[PDB]
């Protein structure tokens, strides 16, 4: 005999199976391996997630570029006029800004940084960060994603569903990353070209 | 004499490889990460409400096992189970 009735509500509430202790911190996303920041867009800690957990993938590392194309120019000095600066040949030693002007005058040899173009450079990069950083989806009740016993057919299909999602997302993320990397490298050197043209024009 | 102005861009003594579509490998100044691979290593409270069975399955808690019965009339955001939990009062299927 039931000794009464259990009141049912409908909520974001779920279950999770783990052996990590309860602690005191501020972070939303919670996994069997533990609480992580939900800040970056991807993780590879676990399929099972809860809350605003960034999408799970299969990859180890998918590095995203935030600067222009590095051309280390470690060659024997040619004593060339100024520094023989080129869009191709790199310019080691310019902490201020991302773009600079090197001049060889009568007075001597000198450099001066720009702020205008480089500010627009970093600006567009900073957006690209934000459009891919801190943005998240919340997932409140998944189906189970690990199986201690094999009941059979049903279990088989959600293993399929799981692998489906991870594979699709993995490839999907892989492309997203690569497309942006190209975009940034394009935008950086294009702005180099744009500044280049501005001078010549 | 005659002046020469000559343009160019900055670089870094130490850079990092990045995977693209144009070239599977390339060196750029400053890299970052898009994949958080690391945990603190514990279920941390703020901002969600947590509740740990610490020896009782949710079914065991919903039914009443005298030991670890404190979960009676207790609410949560996310309930967690320990893999060391078990029925220890009466069996059921």
């Amino acid at each position: 005999a039931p000794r009464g009735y259990f009141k049912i509500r409908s909520g974001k509430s779920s279950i999770m199976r783990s052996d990590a202790p309860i602690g005191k911190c501020n972070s939303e996303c919670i996994t069997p391996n533990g609480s992580i920041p939900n800040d970056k867009p991807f993780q590879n800690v676990n399929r099972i997630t809860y809350g605003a957990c960034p999408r799970y993938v299969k990859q180890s590392t998918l590095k995203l570029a935030t600067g222009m194309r590095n051309v280390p120019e470690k060659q024997t000095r040619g004593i060339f006029g100024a520094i023989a600066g080129f869009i191709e040949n790199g310019w080691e030693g310019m902490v201020d800004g991302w773009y600079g002007f090197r001049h060889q005058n009568s007075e001597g040899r000198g450099q001066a940084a720009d702020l205008k173009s480089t500010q627009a450079a970093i600006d567009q990069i900073n957006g690209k960060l934000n459009r891919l950083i801190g943005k998240t989806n919340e997932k409140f009740h998944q189906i189970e994603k690990e199986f201690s016993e094999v009941e059979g057919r049903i279990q088989d299909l959600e293993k399929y569903v799981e692998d489906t999602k991870i594979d699709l997302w993995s490839y999907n993320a892989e492309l997203l990353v690569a497309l942006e990397n190209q975009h940034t490298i394009d935008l950086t050197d294009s702005e180099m070209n744009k500044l280049f043209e501005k001078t010549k024009k | 004499s005659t002046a020469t102005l000559c343009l160019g861009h900055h670089a870094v003594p130490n850079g990092t490889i990045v995977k693209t579509i144009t070239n599977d490998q390339i060196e750029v100044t400053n890299a970052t990460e898009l994949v958080q691979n690391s945990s603190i290593g514990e279920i941390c409270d703020s901002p969600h409400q947590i509740l740990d069975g610490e020896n009782c399955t949710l079914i065991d808690a919903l039914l009443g096992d005298p030991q670890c019965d404190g979960f009676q009339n207790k609410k949560w955001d996310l309930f967690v189970e320990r893999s060391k939990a078990y029925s220890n009062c009466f069996p059921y299927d």
């Epitope: 470690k74 060659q75 000095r77 520094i83 030693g93 201020d96 040899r109 000198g110 450099q111 | 003594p13």
Partner: antibody, heavy 122, light 108 residues
Framework: QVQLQESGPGLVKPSETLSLTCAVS????????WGWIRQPPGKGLEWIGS????????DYSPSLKSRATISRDTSKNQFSLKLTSVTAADTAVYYC???????????????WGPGVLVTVSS | DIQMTQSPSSLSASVGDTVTITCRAS??????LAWYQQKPGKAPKLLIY???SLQGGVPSRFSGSGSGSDFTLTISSLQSEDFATYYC?????????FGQGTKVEIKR
């Protein structure tokens, strides 16, 4: 990134030559300019002079222009200062510093040497 | 050549206090000044440059402004990690010239 190791005898006989060397670690010596800077303890400090860490074209503070002679080496990633006819007062701490490539510019002394004491051996 | 004046010549205040150190020039130099942090008995480190444009490695709390002859460094919040001798250096004219150096301590 960029670190420096200052080397030399912290003692020197009066009215003698001062020979110092500082190290580079990381970056390429060819791609910057480098100077030295002098500070007796608890007083004002002073810029000594700089050299083309790429080419060898140099400058010196007018006061120490004749007295101080700075050098470099492409080979060993090093660079030296040679100071003649030292005074008893010249007793100080020295530094190696990274300067901007431009002959006239800002952001000078971005990085500094660990600091080596130089006492004249009275 | 071009003397660099530093004011106030001495100062102190407590934890979480804002203090201002002012630099003067013999001739008004157009935003060409540098500030430095010198831990006593340690190698002096660069603090700011070019009329205090923001620099990486130096937390936001350190700030300044440049106006020809009127140059001030501000410690926004005083931590114990902030006791040192602060120097204003001019690169507008050669030879370079330096701040006198203000012994700043914490009144705590």
């Amino acid at each position: 990134q960029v670190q420096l190791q200052e080397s030399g005898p912290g003692l020197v006989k009066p009215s003698e030559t001062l020979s110092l060397t500082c190290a580079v670690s990381g970056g390429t010596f060819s791609a910057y300019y480098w100077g030295w800077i002098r500070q007796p303890p608890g007083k004002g400090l002073e810029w000594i002079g700089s050299i083309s860490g790429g080419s060898g074209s140099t400058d010196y503070s007018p006061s120490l222009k004749s007295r101080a002679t700075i050098s470099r080496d492409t080979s060993k990633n090093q660079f030296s200062l040679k100071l003649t006819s030292v005074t008893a007062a010249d007793t100080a701490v020295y530094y190696c510093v990274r300067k901007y490539w431009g002959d006239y510019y800002a952001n000078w002394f971005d990085v500094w040497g660990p600091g080596v004491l130089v006492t004249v051996s009275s | 050549d071009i003397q660099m004046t530093q004011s106030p010549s001495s100062l102190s205040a407590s934890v979480g206090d804002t203090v201002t150190i002012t630099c003067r020039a013999s001739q008004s130099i157009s935003s060409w000044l540098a500030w430095y942090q010198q831990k006593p008995g340690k190698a002096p480190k660069l603090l700011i440059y070019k009329a205090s444009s923001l620099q990486g490695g130096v937390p936001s709390r350190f700030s300044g402004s440049g106006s020809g002859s009127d140059f001030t460094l501000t410690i926004s919040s005083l931590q114990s990690e902030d006791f040192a001798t602060y120097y204003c250096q001019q690169y507008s004219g050669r030879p370079p010239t330096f701040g006198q150096g203000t012994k700043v301590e914490i009144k705590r």
